[PDB]
């Protein structure tokens, strides 16, 4: 009864690990020796992109589960997949040029807002179930 | 279900975190910091670092929030959760004005976090001694 | 029952807060004035280590719970403990020298992939009988 949410969650976790791998590969390709994170423009775009993704990850997960638990698992699950796609655009877009990140960024933040909305409605509706009203 | 209050707080805090990210985006435009760079303007640098410290601790807050709410008391955890959200509001805007103006909101939100950790640890412990060692 | 998962989760959250404390201590030891995060090489090692940990934390939590819920709580719990240990090695290793991070890094990523695997099997096996 959370099996769909669980699946999306494992998919997104693999995406985030994939992004971390690219930064590791970029460190070798452009000779950026740890702990440094600057010194090659190509590396800096890859690093910053991965950083923005990893920052937003827990926000996506919460919003995903609250929507799926309190509104509809199937609908949240589908939005979740489109979000995973949006960041795929964002990451690879940025990596090529800072201005190519904007599509994937707008898509994934649109989805996140909708998930927030659905989660808020469902939680509200669900709160009225201890006032016995179901709208 | 018996997580409805936790769920509400969680959605509120997630909105706060997205709001912080928006401010960094606005600051990038106001102080002309060309991506992927995050240095150059001191005003931008304070806003960026503040949002970074918030986003780092966010998953730690969520775990501690739910463990406290699940294994100790949902209503008590829920209330602390709201005050934490407020403390982070002070921290972020405080830091944005001056590096030393962050300290109030910092102490508040980390105090709460420690208490939530405490409650979570007790409840989990009590539940563990009741479930594998038959001691409540 | 999720009491074992709950315990590991609170343990790891304490580790993460501990790492953040060390960065705070490093700011004072090497005079790195906020909001700056560069200058002292040793500080940059401590900071980057804590940053790699805090990035991967939500990934560990999700995979930990999915494995524990859909595969086995006791087995996931044990792997969870080994991950916590691997991160302990990573952090302190890296703090001394970038090349001392490698052991704790391999250990913790081994665990993470297995947790992902177990979670995926359990969810699948789970979905195979509707």
């Amino acid at each position: 009864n959370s099996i769909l949410l669980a699946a999306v969650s494992i998919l997104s976790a693999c995406q985030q690990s994939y992004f971390a791998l690219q930064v590791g590969k970029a460190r070798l390709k452009y000779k950026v020796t740890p702990p440094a994170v600057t010194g090659s423009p190509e590396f800096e775009r890859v690093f910053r992109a991965q950083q923005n993704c990893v920052e937003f990850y827990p926000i996506f997960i919460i919003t995903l589960w609250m929507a799926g638990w309190y509104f509809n698992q199937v609908f949240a699950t589908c939005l979740g997949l489109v979000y995973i796609y949006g960041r795929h655009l964002y990451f690879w877009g940025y990596s090529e040029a800072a201005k190519k990140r904007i599509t994937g960024f707008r898509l994934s933040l649109g989805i996140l807002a909708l998930l927030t909305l659905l989660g808020a409605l469902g939680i509200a509706n669900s709160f009225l179930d201890e006032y016995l009203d179901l709208n």
Side-chain angles (χ1 to χ4, degrees), chain A residues 1-54 56-98 100-130 132:
Chain A
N1 207 337
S2 292
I3 296 170
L4 308 185
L5 294 174
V8 171
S9 296
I10 286 289
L11 255 58
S12 64
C14 289
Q15 189 181 43
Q16 289 293 145
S17 293
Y18 185 69
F19 292 162
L21 164 74
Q22 299 309 127
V23 170
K25 292 167 57 167
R27 273 188 180 283
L28 299 168
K29 184 167 198 161
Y30 304 105
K31 320 168 211 300
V32 187
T33 305
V37 290
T38 57
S40 159
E42 291 83 17
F43 174 86
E44 284 177 23
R45 286 195 303 270
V46 172
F47 176 76
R48 190 51 51 204
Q50 184 263 340
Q51 292 289 102
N52 288 158
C53 288
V54 81
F56 266 121
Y57 188 63
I59 296 162
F60 161 64
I61 291 298
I62 283 178
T63 296
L64 174 71
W65 283 74
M66 294 316 92
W69 276 351
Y70 299 88
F71 192 94
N72 182 272
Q73 194 184 188
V74 170
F75 194 24
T77 287
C78 289
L79 291 170
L81 292 174
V82 187
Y83 174 88
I84 289 171
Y85 177 70
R87 294 299 180 190
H88 174 88
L89 299 177
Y90 176 82
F91 181 80
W92 291 110
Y94 205 166
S95 300
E96 183 161 334
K100 285 191 189 66
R101 78 189 194 281
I102 300 154
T103 309
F105 183 79
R106 284 177 190 150
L107 180 52
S108 62
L109 283 183
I111 292 165
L112 208 49
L114 183 62
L115 284 171
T116 300
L117 177 70
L118 301 188
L121 289 178
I123 288 167
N125 186 47
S126 181
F127 175 83
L128 298 205
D129 253 348
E130 71 175 286
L132 286 183

